[PDB]
């Protein structure tokens, strides 16, 4: 109804990224997670969560696609 457009974008991109990684579409999934990270700005807590959640090589694709 008001602001919070960035918050919607953020969660939608995380969720789509997650879904694509699960279908095995790594580049696309990583693309969308990095859209979420880009709108964060203090993404240190987010990046820790992602590191604990993703297989290491998928996480490394993320750090590179930033």
């Amino acid at each position: 109804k008001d602001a919070e457009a960035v918050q919607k974008f953020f969660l939608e991109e995380i969720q789509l990224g997650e879904e694509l990684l699960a279908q095995g579409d790594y580049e696309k999934g990583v693309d969308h997670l990095t859209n979420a990270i880009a709108v964060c700005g203090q993404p240190q807590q987010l990046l820790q969560v992602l590191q604990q959640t993703l297989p290491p090589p998928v996480f490394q694709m993320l750090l590179t696609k930033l």
């Binding site: 008001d2 919070e4 918050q7 919607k8 953020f10 969660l11 964060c40 203090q42 993404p43």
Partner: peptide, 12 residues
């Protein structure tokens, strides 16, 4: 609003 969106973004 949507709490889930607010809470999820709180860390940013």
């Amino acid at each position: 609003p949507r709490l889930s969106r607010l809470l999820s973004y709180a860390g940013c």
